Design a binder for this molecule. Structure first.
Ligand SMILES: CN(Cc1cccc(F)c1)S(N)(=O)=O
Length: 284
């Protein structure tokens, strides 16, 4: 029996290394990672890898790892796949903990835009969780935290994190993580997976996939939102991604909106993440 070494980047930036039989399906690796993380509520999570385009792909747990990574290194990242719309309803604190770690990276990366005050408030709950009660001895008027809070850091943001941290005295890590999530879950891009596309007129848009449905972001004045109940069907042909939208009451025919993706793989990727989120919505 021949085993391949897997390297997984965990959400605190640490690296986990294990071996699986070379014909292993994704689930085998994932089960090992989740056991290492003491994670039971595993269905919200997944493993990603990067292809030679350095684009992110979900490792399909049902398929052989080798037929997915193909020519690439057996190098993966552990990630939230399905963002819970109501994290307070997860059964375990450790589940909320990993969700917070993912959202910290969503914020620092700019995937999850955040006002100055929300950056500072989220940062303040992270500090309370990671370090406990505010301690002036560590701080000082010139303090910069080790923690990454934002896509760009400013002294004003560091100061506001400390001001709000003072107000959390006595808060336990589980409580500070619940507060982090109660705030983050309300942000307009929470759990939104964005895909570059062109509309049928060739205008650059973003397609957003999330729990509630499909977002078409043309510009600030031109946004469309299709809750899952309004989406009949989706398809990809070559580089094309098509959405069928139910008729409004007393209309006879669905409408088709068409999108051009950069290539066939990007269309297939968008299709699969939409199917997977749709199946999530069905079970909520
Ligand atoms: C697997 N499908 C189900 C689906 C229905 C409605 C919305 C969806 F995002 C997915 S499909 N590819 O449309 O035939």
């Amino acid at each position: 029996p021949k085993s391949m070494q897997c390297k997984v980047i965990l959400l605190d930036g640490s690296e986990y290394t294990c071996d699986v039989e070379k014909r292993s399906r994704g689930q085998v690796l994932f089960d090992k990672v989740c056991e290492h993380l003491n994670l039971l509520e595993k269905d919200y999570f997944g493993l990603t890898y990067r292809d030679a385009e350095n684009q992110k792909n979900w490792l399909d747990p049902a398929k052989e790892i080798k037929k997915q990574v193909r020519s690439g290194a057996w190098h993966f990242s552990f990630n939230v796949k399905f963002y819970p719309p109501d994290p307070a309803q997860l059964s375990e604190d450790i589940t909320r903990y990993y969700l917070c770690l993912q959202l910290r990276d969503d914020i620092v990366s700019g995937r999850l835009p955040c006002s100055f005050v929300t950056l500072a408030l989220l940062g303040s709950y992270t500090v309370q969780s990671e370090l406990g009660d505010y301690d002036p001895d560590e701080c000082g008027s010139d303090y910069i935290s080790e923690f990454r809070f934002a896509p760009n850091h400013t002294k004003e943001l560091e100061d506001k994190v400390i001001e709000l941290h003072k107000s959390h005295r006595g808060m336990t890590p589980a409580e500070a993580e619940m507060h982090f999530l109660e705030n983050a879950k309300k942000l307009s891009m929470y759990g939104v997976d964005l895909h570059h596309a062109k509309d049928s007129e060739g205008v650059e848009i973003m397609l957003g996939v999330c729990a509630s449905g499909l977002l078409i972001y043309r510009d600030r004045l031109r946004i469309n939102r299709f809750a899952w109940p309004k989406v009949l069907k989706i398809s990809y042909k070559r580089n094309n991604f098509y959405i069928k939208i139910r008729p409004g009451e007393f209309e006879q025919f669905e409408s088709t909106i068409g999108f051009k993706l950069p290539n066939h793989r990007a269309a297939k990727r968008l299709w699969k993440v939409c199917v997977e989120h749709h199946t999530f919505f069905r079970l909520l």
